[PDB]
Amino acid sequence: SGPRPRGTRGKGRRIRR
RNA sequence: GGCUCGUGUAGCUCAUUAGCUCCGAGCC
């Protein structure tokens, strides 16, 4: 998690599914 | 790692509604 959640899994695999 | 899929028991960035790495899927 960051200053929002996670954005992604690091090769475009974008998070909040 | 090169790339693609899966919030998941998760971390690290500073994003930009995100990003990169895990923890698995599949093949280098």
Side-chain angles (χ1 to χ4, degrees), chain A residues 4-16:
Chain A
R4 290 179 284 154
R6 306 153 193 100
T8 118
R9 316 167 192 162
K11 294 302 201 299
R13 311 217 310 286
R14 297 246 289 234
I15 315 161
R16 306 175 294 231

